[PDB]
Ligand binder design. Structure first.
Ligand code: HEM
Ligand code: HEM
Ligand SMILES: *[C@@H]1O[C@H](CO[C@@H]2O[C@@H](C)[C@@H](O)[C@@H](O)[C@@H]2O)[C@@H](O)[C@H](O)[C@H]1NC(C)=O
Ligand SMILES: C[As](C)(=O)[O-]
Lengths: 259, 144, 141
């Protein structure tokens, strides 16, 4: 039912950085398209609901739009370019702090080798140095939305290092906007950063909404530990910034139970 | 695809390329400019600095092969897909090469042509070569 | 972010470019327009013919902006803030285009200054232009 891909990600070379999705190892990955043709990510978390970010949902909308305004302007696909119809969108009620929304489908998907949800974790797998896999449909080294799925293999990074990188200091009165790309991520106790100093393939525009997936080797199950929020690093800034799934778990479960 | 005028400017230029050198210089530059690509070529030995890369004889030799495939593409602009189907399959299934890099190598090749030909590498001849690199990249991506 | 060694490569290569920067800018635009015709749609008000004086004028502004970025490589976002709002918000230039213009600048340098266009310098410039291109697109929405 979740987190058991037929062909789990298994790179030949265990090198942190970019890899082709050669085996089709991310059946939880979805592709969202905005009303002005911008590709973003979403993540299937059960048969009828996806996570994505609030910023993704707001593309091409007024900062005053509601879930009802947004929902009928989106297009969503799973598997081999399979359009699925959306019933509604639910914004996180504190989305300026926790960059998240949920998407409900009008009907359950049929699960198979290309379409399958990832499991939501109760354990917090985000220890510094934890190796995960982040798939995405974002822009590549030519700044084109990728035609074929790709992933990055990356460690969770030290939170203070990442805060100093983008904000200069952990101390509120010493902070300055230091982001190397000229836009600031949402960084707080609800997020983690991932990456290492390396000229690499990095996540970039459109990858947000995708999962930082961790493979629990005892259960042999795949879990969404983070949802990528800050997809603008693009090998210029050093870290992606991810919403911690454990920090929204209760809100996700209530929402799904209610709708 | 290529006007016959463009086909003409292209083969005119290609006929002057040092077949034994430009392929190694394009591959060599791909590996220096986009260093993540070096992981595919551990059986070439020493790639650890730009001189190591640019003077490595296996780079030069493999370069010849890549150039040779571009020569094939020139002969078959009408069927780049068929011509590159086996190569597409090798790079995808066996090698796991991200298809974004085909365009990067293409572009590095264009840079090398500009580097060697200077002013003869005019904007219109560039434009025609850009059609060729894109066409070669799409065909190499086609079995993905 | 660029290493110290990259920054040194960029500053030196671009110091040699010196007063040619405008002409090289203009030629890079001309290559972009002809190789990638879709880029011409951002300039429907221009004379885009070969040798257009309006293109030479614009090439000079593009050059001055890059010169200013090179002068302020540790503080690029700030130095380019006005331009970044211009490109991302007002003009809505798709990110792909920045890789087209970047490539055409590189081609132009290679064709004009082959002695300076070594592999290492090529790498440092590509990285520099990829940082400029990222700053100018990070606000794109
Ligand atoms: C237009 C672009 C390219 C062309 C025309 C090209 C062409 C070729 C050719 C002709 C061969 C020899 C195949 C054979 O013996 O059957 C080959 C092998 C190979 N190519 Fe490419 N290729 C391209 C791009 C790339 C890129 C971007 C990468 C890696 C980043 C790559 C990695 C390889 C590798 C690892 C091999 C195996 C070489 C060996 O085993 O010694 N290629 N390619
Ligand atoms: C390295 C990349 C680039 C740099 C440094 C750059 C720089 C500039 C500069 C300095 C201006 C003039 C602003 C002024 O007069 O106040 C400008 C305007 C403009 N740029 Fe760019 N630009 C770049 C890339 C692009 C690309 C890729 C496109 C489109 C394909 C583009 C389209 C425009 C347009 C349409 C204008 C307005 C022209 C006008 O005033 O009528 N730019 N850019
Ligand atoms: C959404 O946020 C609500 C308000 O946040 C809380 O109260 C404010 C004044 C601050 O003290 C803040 O740090 C506290 O978190 C929460 O009460 C509510 O639980 C949050 N909702 C969810 C679903 O996470
Ligand atoms: C590999 As690191 C924490 O210096 O980005």
């Amino acid at each position: 039912v979740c987190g058991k891909p037929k062909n789990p990600a298994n790179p030949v070379q265990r090198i942190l950085g970019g890899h082709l999705d050669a085996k089709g190892s991310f059946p939880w990955q979805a592709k969202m398209v905005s009303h002005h043709n911008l590709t973003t990510g979403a993540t299937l978390i059960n048969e009828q609901w996806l996570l994505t970010t609030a910023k993704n949902l707001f593309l091409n909308h007024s900062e005053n739009a509601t879930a009802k305004d947004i929902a009928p302007t989106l297009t969503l696909y799973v598997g081999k370019k399979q359009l699925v119809e959306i019933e509604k969108v639910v914004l996180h009620p504190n989305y300026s702090q926790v960059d998240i929304g949920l998407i409900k489908l009008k009907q359950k998907v049929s699960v198979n080798e290309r379409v399958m949800p990832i499991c939501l974790p109760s354990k917090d797998y985000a220890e510094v140095g934890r190796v995960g896999y982040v798939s995405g449909w974002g822009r590549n080294a030519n700044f084109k939305f990728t035609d074929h799925l790709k992933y990055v293999m990356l460690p969770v990074a030290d939170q203070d290092q990442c805060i100093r990188h983008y904000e200069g200091s952990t101390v509120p009165e010493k902070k300055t906007p230091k982001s190397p790309v000229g836009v600031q991520p949402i960084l707080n106790e609800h997020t983690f950063c991932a990456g290492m100093s390396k000229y690499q393939e990095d996540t970039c525009y459109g990858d947000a909404g995708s999962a930082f997936a961790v493979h629990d080797l005892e259960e042999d199950t795949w879990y969404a530990t983070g949802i990528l929020s800050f997809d603008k690093s693009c090998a210029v800034a050093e870290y992606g910034v991810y919403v911690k799934v454990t920090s929204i778990q209760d809100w996700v479960q209530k929402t799904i139970a209610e709708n | 695809h290529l006007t016959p005028e463009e086909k003409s400017a292209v083969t005119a230029l290609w006929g002057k390329v040092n077949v034994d050198e430009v392929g190694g210089e394009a591959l060599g530059r791909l590996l220096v400019v986009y260093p993540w690509t070096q992981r595919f070529f551990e059986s070439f030995g020493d790639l650890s600095t730009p001189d190591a890369v640019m003077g490595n004889p296996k780079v030069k030799a493999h370069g010849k092969k890549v150039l040779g495939a571009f020569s094939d593409g020139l002969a078959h602009l009408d069927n780049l897909k068929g011509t590159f189907a086996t190569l597409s399959e090798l790079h995808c299934d066996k090698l796991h090469v991200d298809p974004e890099n085909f365009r990067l190598l293409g572009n590095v090749l264009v840079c090398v042509l500009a580097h060697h030909f200077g002013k003869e590498f005019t904007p219109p001849v560039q434009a025609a070569y850009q059609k060729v690199v894109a066409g070669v990249a799409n065909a190499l991506a086609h079995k993905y | 972010v660029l290493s110290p060694a990259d920054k040194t490569n960029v500053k030196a290569a671009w110091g040699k470019v010196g007063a040619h920067a405008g002409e090289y800018g203009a030629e890079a635009l001309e290559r972009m327009f002809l190789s990638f015709p879709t880029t011409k749609t951002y300039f429907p008000h221009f004379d885009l013919s070969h040798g257009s004086a309006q293109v030479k004028g614009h090439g000079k502004k593009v050059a001055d902006a890059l010169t200013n970025a090179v002068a302020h490589v540790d503080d690029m976002p700030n130095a380019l803030s006005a331009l970044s709002d211009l490109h991302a918000h007002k003009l809505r230039v798709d990110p792909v285009n920045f890789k087209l213009l970047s490539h055409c600048l590189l081609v132009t340098l290679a064709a004009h200054l082959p002695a300076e266009f070594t592999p290492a310098v090529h790498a440092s410039l590509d990285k520099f232009l990829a940082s400029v291109s990222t700053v100018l697109t990070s606000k794109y929405r």
